[PDB]
């Protein structure tokens, strides 16, 4: 019996990519999938066979909605200046009580009204939402609503606070100060959401509450088993990667007959807007005796490439990763999971948000290194490349994690819970 299932997510290509994976799994089981998102993503959504609903067609006139992705460079460039000039402690100091994603909350009202009308009109059996924080509509719609989480899930446990990138080796003394500042900023977020929920007359809930079922995507071998069990109603899916239409990534002729290993570079869908960041990374790599393929980002046509490099604004990462020896990443979750699935070690240069946590996780479990912008130099990057390429131990740890991901059954249990909740309205 067919269910009607509606997905939505924030503007981030990463959050949408997460849900596409889930939707694919459900479409095979015979369900009708709908996706409410922005027009940039109509092509990939319909290509996967999901029905596309534009949020913009359902805006309230007084509360308009905007795809943030093309305007994101203002915000990205600020974060970059800050991250480049300050340690993560100093960053949290000079952040007053500001949470990393509070200004996002004020302007969420448009998306909220939209989702109310869309759920009313399409009368779905269940909804799923990949969002950074819960939203009033998820508690006003007739059907149940499953938050999906693709960011680092350390926030689902009682442990190091999220978004700080604390290590498991961090002594008692150095974490103490960061957790105070982070407890504080979590309270600023709670107060921002109160206004949002107040506006729609909905009892405030915790920012990452799962009423009945929550799904977080993250590799089981990287999950935080040492902190105990995740929060309630929260289930894990080890990975959620969409299938690629391309299967063979042909290498560019520019790089044929050039020495060394093949290395992929991407600072993601969002931070790659900052040309200063890419320039800072690539300039030293000109002298690295390897071949680089580079995602250059939306402003990539104004980024200089050297003889050992080839790139374009957007690359088929899932098709390419199998062919590389190393992946220099920003520590985004989807890139982390695609990278590990393909069996490749990582050098993570974290830019914002959950990336600090993922970066530290990669370092703590010996899956690569963490190299921060503040302590960044050509000499250090070039040496991290040589070190990770030649570290037998790291290369074996990554093979093991890969093997677990490629055979995981986490999907089977998750699907059941979705179907069950959709039909019974209870777990």
Ligand X SMILES: O=C1C[C@@H](c2ccc(O)cc2)Oc2cc(O)cc(O)c21
79 binds, among ligand X, ligand UDP, none (CB under 5 to 8 A by kind): ligand X
Q: Of the two residues 134 and 335, which places its CB atom closer to ligand UDP in the complex?
A: 335
Residues 216-245 contacting ligand X, CB under 6 A: none
Residues 50-89 contacting ligand X, CB under 6 A: 72, 75-76, 79
Q: Tell me how crowded residue 145 is: count the other CB atoms within 10 A of its CB.
A: 25
Residues 312-331 contacting ligand UDP, CB under 6 A: 314-315, 317
- Classify the phi-psi angles of 160: left when phi > 0, otherwise alpha if psi is within -120 to 50, otherwise beta: beta
Q: Of the two residues 126 and 328, which places its CB atom closer to ligand UDP in the complex?
A: 328
As a whole number of angstroms, the distance between CA 130 and CA 176 comes to 31
Contact 340, 270 (CB under 8 A): no
100 binds ligand X, rule: CB under 6 A: yes
Q: Of the two residues 271 and 363, which places its CB atom closer to ligand UDP in the complex?
A: 271
Q: Of the two residues 103 and 322, which places its CB atom closer to ligand X in the complex?
A: 103
Binding residue (CB under 6 A) for ligand UDP from 6, 7, 14, 33: 14
13 binds, among ligand UDP, ligand X, none (CB under 5 to 8 A by kind): ligand UDP
311 binds ligand UDP, rule: CB under 6 A: no
| Sign of torsion over alpha carbons 277, 72, 133, 115 | negative
Q: Of the two residues 335 and 402, which places its CB atom closer to ligand X in the complex?
A: 335
Residue 282, beta-bridge partner list: none
101 binds, among ligand X, ligand UDP, none (CB under 5 to 8 A by kind): ligand X
156 binds ligand X, rule: CB under 6 A: no
Residue span binding ligand X (CB under 6 A) among the ranges 116-124, 306-314, 334-342, 346-354:
346-354
Main-chain dihedrals φ then ψ at residue 49, nearest 5 degrees: 90, 15
Which tokens belong to 388? 């990770």
72 binds, among ligand X, ligand UDP, none (CB under 5 to 8 A by kind): ligand X
Q: Of the two residues 76 and 398, which places its CB atom closer to ligand X in the complex?
A: 76
Annotated ligand binding at 338? The verdict is yes
| Sign of torsion over alpha carbons 131, 132, 134, 136 | negative
As a whole number of angstroms, the distance between CA 96 and CA 184 comes to 9
Say if residue 142 is exposed, middle or buried (CB neighbours under 10 Å; 0-12, 13-18, 19+): exposed
Which tokens belong to 336? 């982390």
Interruptions in the chain after residues (C–N over 2.5 Å) = none
For residue 12, how far is the Cα from the chain centroid? 8
Q: How many residues bind ligand X (CB under 6 A)?
A: 13
182 binds ligand X, rule: CB under 6 A: no
Closest CA to 133 of 158, 103, 166, 157: 103
As a whole number of angstroms, the distance between CA 243 and CA 247 comes to 9
**Minimum distance from residue 355 beta carbon to ligand X (Å):** 8
Contact 369, 387 (CB under 8 A): yes
Q: Of the two residues 185 and 308, which places its CB atom closer to ligand X in the complex?
A: 185
As a whole number of angstroms, the distance between CA 291 and CA 257 comes to 10
Annotated ligand binding at 330? The verdict is yes
351 binds ligand X, rule: CB under 6 A: yes
Binding mask 214-253 for ligand UDP (x = CB under 6 A): ----------------------------------------
275 binds ligand UDP, rule: CB under 6 A: no
Residues 3-32 contacting ligand X, CB under 6 A: 12
**Minimum distance from residue 269 beta carbon to ligand UDP (Å):** 4
Binding mask 332-351 for ligand UDP (x = CB under 6 A): xxxx--x-------------
Residues that bind ligand X (CB under 6 A): 12, 72, 75-76, 79, 100-101, 132, 270-271, 351-353
Q: Which residues carry a binding-site annotation? A: 14, 17, 242, 269-270, 295, 314-315, 317, 330, 333-335, 338, 354-355
Q: Which residues carry a binding-site annotation for UDP-alpha-D-glucose? A: 14, 295, 315, 330, 333-335, 338, 354-355
Residues that bind ligand UDP (CB under 6 A): 12-14, 17, 266, 268-270, 295, 314-315, 317, 332-335, 338
Q: Which residues carry a binding-site annotation for UDP? A: 17, 242, 269-270, 295, 314-315, 317, 330, 333-335, 338
């Amino acid at each position: 019996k067919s269910l009607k299932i509606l997905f939505t997510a924030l503007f981030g290509p990463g959050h949408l990519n997460a849900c596409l994976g889930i939707g694919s799994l459900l479409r095979k089981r015979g369900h009708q999938i709908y996706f409410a998102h922005f027009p940039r993503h109509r092509a990939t959504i319909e290509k996967h066979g999901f029905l596309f609903i534009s949020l913009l067609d359902y805006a309230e006139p007084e509360f308009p909605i905007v795809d943030m992705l093309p305007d994101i460079g203002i915000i990205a460039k600020f974060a970059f200046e800050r991250m480049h000039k300050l340690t993560p402690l100093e960053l949290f100091r000079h952040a007053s009580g500001k949470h990393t994603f509070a200004g996002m909350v004020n302007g969420s009202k448009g998306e909220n009204y939209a989702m109310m009308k869309i759920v009313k009109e399409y009368k779905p059996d269940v909804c799923l939402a990949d969002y950074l924080f819960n939203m009033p509509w998820m508690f006003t719609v007739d059907c149940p609503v499953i938050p999906v989480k693709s960011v680092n899930p350390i926030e689902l446990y009682n442990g190091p606070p999220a978004l700080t990138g604390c290590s498991i080796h961090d002594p008692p003394s150095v974490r103490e100060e960061i957790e105070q500042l982070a407890r504080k900023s979590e309270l600023e977020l709670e107060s921002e959401l109160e206004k949002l929920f107040a506006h729609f007359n909905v009892p405030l809930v915790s920012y990452n509450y799962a009423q009945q079922l929550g799904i977080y995507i993250y590799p089981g071998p990287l999950d935080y088993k040492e902190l105990g069990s995740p929060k309630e109603n929260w289930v894990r899916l080890d990975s959620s990667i969409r299938s690629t239409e391309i299967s063979n990534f042909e290498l560019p002729e520019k790089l044929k007959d050039k020495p060394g290993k093949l290395i992929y570079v991407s600072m993601g869908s969002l931070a790659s807007a900052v040309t200063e960041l890419l320039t800072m990374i690539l300039t030293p790599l000109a002298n690295s005796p390897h071949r680089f393929i580079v995602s250059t980002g939306p402003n990539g046509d104004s980024i200089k490439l050297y003889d050992n490099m080839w790139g374009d604004k957007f690359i088929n990462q899932v098709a390419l990763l199998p062919k590389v020896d190393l992946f220099i990443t920003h520590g985004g979750s989807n890139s982390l999971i695609e990278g590990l699935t393909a069996g490749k070690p990582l050098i993570a240069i974290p830019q914002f948000g959950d990336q600090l946590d993922n970066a530290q996780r990669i370092a703590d479990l010996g899956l690569g290194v963490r190299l921060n912008l503040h302590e960044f130099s050509g000499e250090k990057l070039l040496k991290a490349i040589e070190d990770v390429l030649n570290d037998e131990k790291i290369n074996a740890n990554v093979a093991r994690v890969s093997e677990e991901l490629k055979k995981s059954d986490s999907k089977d249990k998750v699907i059941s819970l979705i179907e069950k909740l959709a039909r019974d309205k209870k777990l």
